[PDB]
Write a protein that holds these residues in place. Structure first.
Motif, PDB file in Angstrom:
ATOM      1  N   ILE C  43      39.087  33.755  34.537  1.00 24.83           N
ATOM      2  CA  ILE C  43      40.533  33.976  34.601  1.00 24.83           C
ATOM      3  C   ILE C  43      40.962  35.193  33.771  1.00 24.83           C
ATOM      4  O   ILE C  43      42.095  35.627  33.870  1.00 24.83           O
ATOM      5  CB  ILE C  43      41.273  32.646  34.328  1.00 24.83           C
ATOM      6  CG1 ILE C  43      40.974  31.670  35.480  1.00 24.83           C
ATOM      7  CG2 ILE C  43      42.784  32.776  34.153  1.00 24.83           C
ATOM      8  CD1 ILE C  43      41.182  30.233  35.111  1.00 24.83           C
ATOM      9  N   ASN C  44      40.073  35.811  32.996  1.00 27.37           N
ATOM     10  CA  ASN C  44      40.328  37.084  32.335  1.00 27.37           C
ATOM     11  C   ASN C  44      40.670  38.183  33.348  1.00 27.37           C
ATOM     12  O   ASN C  44      40.017  38.291  34.382  1.00 27.37           O
ATOM     13  CB  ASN C  44      39.123  37.487  31.474  1.00 27.37           C
ATOM     14  CG  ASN C  44      38.742  36.470  30.431  1.00 27.37           C
ATOM     15  OD1 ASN C  44      38.013  35.525  30.685  1.00 27.37           O
ATOM     16  ND2 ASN C  44      39.223  36.634  29.228  1.00 27.37           N
ATOM     17  N   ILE C  45      41.658  39.030  33.065  1.00 29.60           N
ATOM     18  CA  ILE C  45      41.998  40.166  33.938  1.00 29.60           C
ATOM     19  C   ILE C  45      40.901  41.231  33.871  1.00 29.60           C
ATOM     20  O   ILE C  45      40.505  41.779  34.887  1.00 29.60           O
ATOM     21  CB  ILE C  45      43.406  40.717  33.604  1.00 29.60           C
ATOM     22  CG1 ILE C  45      44.517  40.013  34.402  1.00 29.60           C
ATOM     23  CG2 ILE C  45      43.574  42.218  33.869  1.00 29.60           C
ATOM     24  CD1 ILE C  45      44.651  38.531  34.102  1.00 29.60           C
ATOM     25  N   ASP C  46      40.357  41.511  32.698  1.00 31.07           N
ATOM     26  CA  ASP C  46      39.309  42.502  32.479  1.00 31.07           C
ATOM     27  C   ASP C  46      38.345  42.039  31.384  1.00 31.07           C
ATOM     28  O   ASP C  46      38.542  40.996  30.764  1.00 31.07           O
ATOM     29  CB  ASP C  46      39.934  43.886  32.225  1.00 31.07           C
ATOM     30  CG  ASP C  46      40.672  44.067  30.904  1.00 31.07           C
ATOM     31  OD1 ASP C  46      41.449  45.030  30.791  1.00 31.07           O
ATOM     32  OD2 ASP C  46      40.505  43.248  29.979  1.00 31.07           O
ATOM     33  N   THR C  49      38.810  42.086  26.314  1.00 24.96           N
ATOM     34  CA  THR C  49      38.989  41.108  25.232  1.00 24.96           C
ATOM     35  C   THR C  49      37.671  40.488  24.758  1.00 24.96           C
ATOM     36  O   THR C  49      37.622  39.912  23.679  1.00 24.96           O
ATOM     37  CB  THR C  49      40.003  40.033  25.661  1.00 24.96           C
ATOM     38  OG1 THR C  49      40.464  39.293  24.567  1.00 24.96           O
ATOM     39  CG2 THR C  49      39.454  39.029  26.650  1.00 24.96           C
ATOM     40  N   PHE C  50      36.586  40.589  25.531  1.00 21.01           N
ATOM     41  CA  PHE C  50      35.361  39.840  25.274  1.00 21.01           C
ATOM     42  C   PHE C  50      34.632  40.252  23.997  1.00 21.01           C
ATOM     43  O   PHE C  50      34.352  41.430  23.778  1.00 21.01           O
ATOM     44  CB  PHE C  50      34.397  39.944  26.458  1.00 21.01           C
ATOM     45  CG  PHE C  50      34.786  39.245  27.738  1.00 21.01           C
ATOM     46  CD1 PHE C  50      35.519  38.053  27.723  1.00 21.01           C
ATOM     47  CD2 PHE C  50      34.332  39.745  28.965  1.00 21.01           C
ATOM     48  CE1 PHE C  50      35.812  37.397  28.916  1.00 21.01           C
ATOM     49  CE2 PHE C  50      34.622  39.078  30.159  1.00 21.01           C
ATOM     50  CZ  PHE C  50      35.367  37.900  30.139  1.00 21.01           C
ATOM     51  N   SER C  51      34.224  39.253  23.214  1.00 22.73           N
ATOM     52  CA  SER C  51      33.167  39.394  22.216  1.00 22.73           C
ATOM     53  C   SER C  51      31.857  39.697  22.952  1.00 22.73           C
ATOM     54  O   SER C  51      31.559  38.976  23.904  1.00 22.73           O
ATOM     55  CB  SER C  51      33.014  38.095  21.419  1.00 22.73           C
ATOM     56  OG  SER C  51      34.231  37.698  20.824  1.00 22.73           O
ATOM     57  N   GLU C  54      29.677  37.051  24.914  1.00 22.48           N
ATOM     58  CA  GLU C  54      30.086  36.566  26.235  1.00 22.48           C
ATOM     59  C   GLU C  54      29.748  37.593  27.313  1.00 22.48           C
ATOM     60  O   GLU C  54      30.322  38.680  27.351  1.00 22.48           O
ATOM     61  CB  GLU C  54      31.594  36.294  26.287  1.00 22.48           C
ATOM     62  CG  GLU C  54      32.040  35.049  25.539  1.00 22.48           C
ATOM     63  CD  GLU C  54      31.771  33.762  26.318  1.00 22.48           C
ATOM     64  OE1 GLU C  54      32.710  32.952  26.447  1.00 22.48           O
ATOM     65  OE2 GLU C  54      30.635  33.535  26.782  1.00 22.48           O
ATOM     66  N   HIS C  55      28.833  37.234  28.218  1.00 22.04           N
ATOM     67  CA  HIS C  55      28.441  38.028  29.395  1.00 22.04           C
ATOM     68  C   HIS C  55      27.889  39.431  29.097  1.00 22.04           C
ATOM     69  O   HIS C  55      27.859  40.302  29.960  1.00 22.04           O
ATOM     70  CB  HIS C  55      29.573  38.051  30.435  1.00 22.04           C
ATOM     71  CG  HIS C  55      30.117  36.695  30.761  1.00 22.04           C
ATOM     72  ND1 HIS C  55      31.445  36.309  30.655  1.00 22.04           N
ATOM     73  CD2 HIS C  55      29.372  35.624  31.141  1.00 22.04           C
ATOM     74  CE1 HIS C  55      31.462  35.010  30.965  1.00 22.04           C
ATOM     75  NE2 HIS C  55      30.237  34.579  31.266  1.00 22.04           N
ATOM     76  N   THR C  90      39.574  35.911  39.219  1.00 21.96           N
ATOM     77  CA  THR C  90      40.668  34.978  39.539  1.00 21.96           C
ATOM     78  C   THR C  90      41.929  35.296  38.755  1.00 21.96           C
ATOM     79  O   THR C  90      43.007  35.146  39.295  1.00 21.96           O
ATOM     80  CB  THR C  90      40.350  33.494  39.379  1.00 21.96           C
ATOM     81  OG1 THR C  90      39.969  33.173  38.094  1.00 21.96           O
ATOM     82  CG2 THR C  90      39.238  33.024  40.271  1.00 21.96           C
ATOM     83  N   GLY C  91      41.830  35.854  37.560  1.00 23.59           N
ATOM     84  CA  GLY C  91      42.946  36.447  36.850  1.00 23.59           C
ATOM     85  C   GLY C  91      43.658  37.530  37.648  1.00 23.59           C
ATOM     86  O   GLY C  91      44.845  37.423  37.897  1.00 23.59           O
ATOM     87  N   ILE C 154      33.930  25.077  40.173  1.00 24.15           N
ATOM     88  CA  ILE C 154      35.326  24.949  40.630  1.00 24.15           C
ATOM     89  C   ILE C 154      36.054  26.307  40.703  1.00 24.15           C
ATOM     90  O   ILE C 154      36.841  26.541  41.618  1.00 24.15           O
ATOM     91  CB  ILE C 154      36.094  23.889  39.808  1.00 24.15           C
ATOM     92  CG1 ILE C 154      37.522  23.713  40.335  1.00 24.15           C
ATOM     93  CG2 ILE C 154      36.138  24.218  38.327  1.00 24.15           C
ATOM     94  CD1 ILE C 154      38.298  22.516  39.817  1.00 24.15           C
ATOM     95  N   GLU C 155      35.741  27.254  39.818  1.00 26.72           N
ATOM     96  CA  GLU C 155      36.306  28.607  39.838  1.00 26.72           C
ATOM     97  C   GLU C 155      35.850  29.447  41.030  1.00 26.72           C
ATOM     98  O   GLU C 155      36.570  30.340  41.458  1.00 26.72           O
ATOM     99  CB  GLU C 155      35.938  29.372  38.563  1.00 26.72           C
ATOM    100  CG  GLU C 155      36.364  28.754  37.233  1.00 26.72           C
ATOM    101  CD  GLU C 155      35.423  27.691  36.664  1.00 26.72           C
ATOM    102  OE1 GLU C 155      34.239  27.657  37.057  1.00 26.72           O
ATOM    103  OE2 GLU C 155      35.878  26.907  35.808  1.00 26.72           O
TER     104      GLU C 155
END
Ligand SMILES: Nc1ncnc2c1ncn2[C@@H]1O[C@H](COP(=O)(O)OP(=O)(O)NP(=O)(O)O)[C@@H](O)[C@H]1O
Ligand SMILES: Nc1ncnc2c1ncn2[C@@H]1O[C@H](COP(=O)(O)OP(=O)(O)NP(=O)(O)O)[C@@H](O)[C@H]1O
Ligand SMILES: Nc1ncnc2c1ncn2[C@@H]1O[C@H](COP(=O)(O)OP(=O)(O)NP(=O)(O)O)[C@@H](O)[C@H]1O
Ligand SMILES: O=c1ccn([C@@H]2O[C@H](COP(=O)(O)OP(=O)(O)OP(=O)(O)O)[C@@H](O)[C@H]2O)c(=O)[nH]1
Ligand SMILES: O=c1ccn([C@@H]2O[C@H](COP(=O)(O)OP(=O)(O)OP(=O)(O)O)[C@@H](O)[C@H]2O)c(=O)[nH]1
Ligand SMILES: O=c1ccn([C@@H]2O[C@H](COP(=O)(O)OP(=O)(O)OP(=O)(O)O)[C@@H](O)[C@H]2O)c(=O)[nH]1
Ligand SMILES: NC(=O)CC[C@H](N)C(=O)O
Ligand SMILES: NC(=O)CC[C@H](N)C(=O)O
Ligand SMILES: NC(=O)CC[C@H](N)C(=O)O
Ligand SMILES: [Mg+2]
Ligand SMILES: [Mg+2]
Ligand SMILES: [Mg+2]
Lengths: 542, 542, 542
Positions: C43-46, C49-51, C54-55, C90-91, C154-155
């Protein structure tokens, strides 16, 4: 081969067996040879154990298969002669795969739902689809498979998974799927609500079948907005959504599918190369008919209409042949019993008001004591009041009991099904030595029976049976020196198959079930005889 | 807090919002403070964009929230004052989680449907369940959440998954789930068919909620066999299956749930510690009432009943207060238009036969040109024939247009919503400078209006608005030197909020929507005035 | 357009982004223009923001889009220039549909997951698939869509449902689906187990996609029995099941898919009309290479390899260009900190043993205090021991801090990111006034920098940035009168973009991220400079 899978959407008892039959009459009208399979996801091997309140009456095939009443809808519409294995069940499939595993035929590999059960379902469908069921030994060209139940029932999933594989085992021109679904219309709102059909198509798609037609079952026709909403959400073209609204008789369903265009669909969908006119005529006669006849049905199983389904169709075929409206006065036979008069007198007088206001009476077949004394009460009424009478199976046995009790005066007389203490045991347990079950030959023993004249004066007839009990040959003479003539008997003459009473307008017992051989333009002769007699026309017909 | 989740089974538009309201009146009758949340799985932020054919009319809250009509069912039954955020949507939830992610509040972790959307749903439900909605600032004790749609819709699954987690975030005494499902009964068979309820409970169980009540919605009461079949397959105790059959009015639903025993259920299920008598009395009065009144509803949106839902309830509250049956003659206003008479004359004469045979007329609110000339036609009828008239929002604006066209004689007069070329622009676009939307104070500018007397002779009233357009203060004097008195105006007197016509039995325009403040034992004064006037009793009441 | 949907089966982090890139190199090798979309169901737009845990790392596009590292795998393999909206979330989709609803563009209808979200996904895929991403303005011919996550999350379901509709919106020759699934092989048994791939294909089929290829991911090649078992249960032809076993480098994956035959598949599956030889050569060189180079990576985010993904690829491109094996000594920079020596001395001495045994050092980019003092420790080592140094973004800023602390002797010197109390604030917060984020032009301010010679002696370069902080122009002169030359600066000369130190073998700071423009046959000049310098060859190259 061509295959049409008819699936049920939201409820069972939706008309999906009349859609499967109507599609079979449309393909019959395109000159094709048609066969049918009913898949019942239940674990019963056959219908022979069922109480008639479960899934309606037990239909009997020529080979003695006790099957679902949908095998009777196919036989009435297609005029075919189905076999025991045209009813396919999870019982019959798991028993077949289990015996094949015990015999070692799976070559020491593990047997599973996929592939081995789903392969046995596809083998069985192909094997049965090639058996001749028409009057000629001609191979079928199209097989209509109806899947009983609804999609997403846990019992149904082996068959949905088998047809998911099958639609790629055969080329697309050879397999097509119809989905029959409910479109409810609640009184509080009056919108036709398509959500349960969307969820049902989404379940069928999720189990891997794409419906080639969506047949919406609703009380009155779809609004174009509702038909377009189905198209958007069910992913189906607007001409590919059908409504089958409530019709005046089932003879309008082939014609309703013809108006909605399914013939112009199957001819392009299945690579295919007048008779709807007789369904058109019958439906238009049925709507035009204006003066009544009324038969009292002296039923045991009277809680539900579907418990006498082939009997009601045989009465309607006979009433359409004699050009009358038919009013079946449904009577629970237990209400005719003099014990009901002691404690439920409003039921007793309602039943007797119905029985006395009937123009003729039918005592249909059955098993076990409950309601028997009311069936004897109605046969005694029919003798004494001279009202036309048909006794079917149990109704012939109880006519021989009644004539014993109230004409010979043997007040203790009964069938040994119901009272094994009985002196004068006029009806006796008498099994086969190969139950007199399935088709058998009856021979006439006389020239001049009204039943021999109704059967077209051949010296024999071939008819279908359920029973275990028979008229006792030790007491036969004592009935024959008085008013009962056993006009029809078996090839060795040990069993009484037809009885006629002297000096009565029409009073016949038959040991077989005539209703299974009734066809929409050809009623079964005994039911035609009762209809003719009750309107007074049986004297003119002879 | 206590929480009750009401889920929908097979169709939406089933009565699930009347069950949620009825449960709220039962808990209100146990002396509890009650609040409600409507979850709409749709992606719209609010109802303010909707055409009234989608999900019925747009309800307006005190704070100016444009919400679903279920927020009006809760306000009518519970007599509460809900806020914008008592309507929760996937739009409002995904917008809230998306803004919270852009602000960085998820601390550089990935945001997901689980946990982050499902956590925001549980935060929001808890946050709103604590807001005071009664007349006192008392915290709610029970929150009824109704989940709109049906279970197993793809939009619904975030909320079913959020309540699957929630039922373990709170102790069992604090959370309970009701499932409202259809039990269809097709005409061809007459069995009540439970399969879609079994599949719907199996879907709800498969999404991880066990229904604490199953509320079967059917046209007539369940047979005990059908209620026991639901119990076997839905895994629910016999006293825990409820039927809510079709009732004579919705006031019998709280009482039907009381007979079926839900009060004796929630008191043991939710660890809880007379007023059903007023619903009993109202329902028994409504069944007893015997002489009619008839209102012509001069609707734009007349295709569906739900498009005037709060208006129909305000007319029924007023008719029950004046002790009459109400016959709403629904008229599509486009059929009153003189252009219809040129090509659809059977529609034109049907509409005018309905309008002339009405005892009084209501011109309800709306937006955009279509049907406006028919609303003007009906106001001209109501003036000239002296029939009692209520004009709501658009109906006040069109009363000022009508009086301009046919009393001042300004034949070009129109609202500048509909014709921006107009000379004599008597109604003008006039936004807020903080749309006159939500609750606002109206002041009376006179002692002696019949509307001031119907509102109980306070010098002000506080009422709810939708509109963007107003009566022009440049033309106000030219209307006031003739028969229109603008009896009610805003706090600064720039806007006309109520109009009354001289020398007419009852002819009032209101700029607000009175129907939103109608309550079953307290009708909105304008609708009571129209009912009183049309039966002639408005003169006696004063 | 042609579309290839790559779906993930059982786990994410399976290699599905290398399959999507390898398919893109195979189609590039057939002369086709290729584009890619990464769908991230989060649901993140981009990614901004990620540490970095994460990914993996945040990749930066030419337009300043902060995106997933899969957009870097596509750019490395296809040599394209993707835009912000080639990452779809999905964001981004729910924000787009929500803004479109608030603007009224859905015409007062209810907006839903089907159709409106699933339509916006198909619009977006078509819209982006037509944008030119090659060096010429040529329209793409094939678009590879990779769906991140796994099927049945579910996403993910809005996108699987959108591609279920899409495969019928476009003709079959234009859409194809690859499913990438795990085939585990547990140590206890040594069977390759296909069940999770069967369940994953059955989930993908149940969501309405039939996989046109099944790409089995396993540690070592499939046995033919295991490949035939996949075919039986996944309903896919034997040549249509691919194994992608663990390879020596990712350059063997296009060639492994070529051996397994996917080129001879897509040419017949997608109606399509030498360059794999360079991947063949590179892979065969990488296997042949025999003498090492070692770089110390002085990382903050050293917990996971994927946190420096483009940096590791830029070091491997440079090592393959200088014909050496690369040993990246991964050092957690916090272990170089003199505070670690007081309590975790085995970590301190391990980190310093690694840093001293390295042939050159890389201080990569990052944000926030933690690990900064260890990065300063390693830059001080690199100056004093004369070891070759590359400082990227944060590493240029910390080179200017280090030279302040230990060459100018300003012991309080720091970046104002880390200590806003600081006197001598040599690095300063300095935003854009249109963050220096995305592509920008750097101009050289000298003829004779070793970085100007490594960049091929053009007077400018265009490179990609993340940062918020810059070298302070008040302190610039005080650094320039000593050993630091700011050789590269922005178009207005306000910002220092490249720094070089005098009388050191190779010591450069860059303010941008060179690793994003590294390509397998064309390393980024700074990483090539570090590799050349650490093996001593940088003097010979000039
Ligand atoms: N279009 C129709 N209008 C009115 N009645 C109908 C219509 N179609 C069928 N019927 C009757 O509706 C009942 C249900 O039909 P049937 O075909 O037996 O249901 P089914 O779904 O096929 N049941 P099952 O065998 O249990 O899976 C039968 O009595 C039909 O004769
Ligand atoms: N027991 C009942 N008998 C007859 N009518 C009813 C009954 N219960 C409710 N209704 C009416 O049936 C309609 C449907 O009720 P409503 O509560 O609006 O449906 P809903 O399922 O709640 N719809 P949605 O808001 O779209 O999820 C309303 O007009 C009710 O007033
Ligand atoms: N065939 C292979 N053998 C060995 N390593 C591989 C192979 N294919 C890919 N890898 C590496 O395996 C890791 C996983 O690849 P990647 O393509 O990033 O996974 P992904 O499933 O695409 N992840 P996500 O972006 O989270 O949906 C990467 O570091 C690849 O470089
Ligand atoms: O035609 C048939 C044949 C067989 N069956 C078998 O009977 C099972 C039950 O199918 P039902 O239609 O009887 O559903 P139900 O009893 O659960 O609910 P009701 O609507 O009937 O109240 C089915 O799952 C299937 O195995 C049929 O349903 N219909
Ligand atoms: O009360 C509400 C609120 C919102 N919604 C939202 O509207 C969506 C559609 O729910 P519907 O009830 O309209 O179903 P449908 O249109 O697909 O089929 P019909 O029976 O109506 O012909 C739901 O999935 C939900 O997101 C409701 O349905 N009901
Ligand atoms: O490439 C991507 C992009 C995005 N996502 C998004 O991240 C979500 C989580 O996908 P994960 O792969 O992280 O699964 P998990 O964390 O639940 O379990 P692990 O195997 O990782 O321990 C996915 O459902 C998807 O929304 C990915 O997974 N992969
Ligand atoms: N089906 C029947 O009616 C059979 C009649 C009798 N009960 C018998 O079983 O022999
Ligand atoms: N809701 C309404 O009827 C508003 C009246 C008028 N159309 C307005 O919009 O201002
Ligand atoms: N990405 C980076 O390393 C940026 C460097 C420094 N923290 C800045 O943010 O400006
Ligand atoms: Mg059937
Ligand atoms: Mg509702
Ligand atoms: Mg990936």
């Amino acid at each position: 081969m061509k295959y049409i899978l008819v699936t049920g959407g939201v409820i069972s008892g939706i008309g999906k067996g009349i859609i499967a039959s109507s599609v079979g009459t449309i393909l019959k009208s395109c000159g094709l040879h048609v066969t049918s399979i009913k898949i019942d996801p239940y674990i019963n091997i056959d219908a022979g154990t069922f109480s008639p309140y479960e899934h309606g009456e037990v239909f009997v095939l020529d080979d003695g298969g006790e099957v679902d009443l949908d095998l009777g809808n196919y036989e009435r519409f297609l005029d075919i002669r189905l076999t025991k294995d045209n009813n396919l069940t999870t019982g019959k499939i798991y028993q077949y795969v289990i015996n094949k595993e015990r015999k070692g035929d799976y070559l020491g590999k593990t047997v599973q739902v996929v592939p081995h059960i789903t392969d046995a379902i596809q083998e069985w469908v192909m094997r049965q689809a090639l058996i001749p069921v028409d009057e000629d030994g001609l191979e079928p060209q199209v097989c209509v498979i109806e899947l009983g139940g609804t999609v997403g029932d846990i019992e149904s999933m082996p068959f949905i998974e088998a047809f998911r594989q099958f639609q790629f085992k055969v080329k697309r021109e050879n397999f097509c799927n119809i989905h029959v679904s409910l479109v409810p219309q609640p009184s509080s709102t009056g919108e036709q609500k398509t959500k349960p059909t969307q969820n049902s198509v989404r379940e069928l798609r999720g189990l891997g079948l794409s419906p080639d037609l969506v047949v919406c079952r609703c009380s009155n026709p779809l609004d174009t907005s509702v038909k377009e909403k189905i198209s958007m959400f069910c992913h189906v073209e607007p001409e590919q959504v059908i409504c089958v609204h409530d019709v005046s008789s089932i003879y309008r369903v082939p014609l309703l599918l013809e108006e909605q265009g399914v013939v112009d669909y199957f001819l392009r969908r299945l690579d295919l190369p007048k008779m709807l006119m007789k369904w058109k005529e019958m439906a238009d006669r049925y709507d035009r008919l204006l003066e009544t006849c009324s038969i009292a049905l002296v039923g045991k199983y009277t809680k539900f209409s579907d418990s006498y389904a082939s009997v009601i169709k045989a009465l309607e075929h006979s009433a359409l042949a004699i050009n009358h409206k038919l009013e079946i006065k449904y009577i629970d036979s237990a209400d005719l019993e003099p014990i009901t008069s002691q404690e439920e007198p409003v039921r007793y007088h309602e039943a007797w008001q119905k029985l006395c206001s009937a123009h003729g009476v039918l005592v249909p077949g059955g098993f076990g004591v409950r309601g028997t004394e009311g069936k004897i009460q109605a046969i005694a009424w029919a003798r004494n009041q001279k009202k036309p009478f048909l006794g079917v199976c149990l109704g012939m046995q109880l006519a021989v009991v009644e004539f014993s009790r109230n004409v010979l005066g043997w007040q203790d007389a009964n069938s040994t099904e119901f009272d094994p203490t009985t002196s004068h045991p006029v009806v006796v347990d008498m099994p086969e030595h190969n139950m007199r079950l399935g088709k058998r030959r009856t021979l006439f023993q006389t020239k001049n029976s009204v039943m021999r004249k109704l059967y077209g004066d051949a010296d024999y007839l071939e008819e279908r049976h359920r029973h275990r009990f028979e008229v006792n040959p030790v007491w036969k003479k004592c009935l024959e020196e008085q008013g009962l003539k056993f006009v029809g008997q078996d090839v060795e003459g040990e069993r009484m198959e037809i009885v006629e009473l002297e000096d009565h307008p029409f009073f016949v017992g038959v040991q077989y079930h005539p209703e299974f051989l009734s066809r929409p333009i050809k009623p079964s002769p005994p039911y035609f005889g009762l209809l003719l007699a009750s309107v007074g026309r049986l004297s003119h017909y002879l």
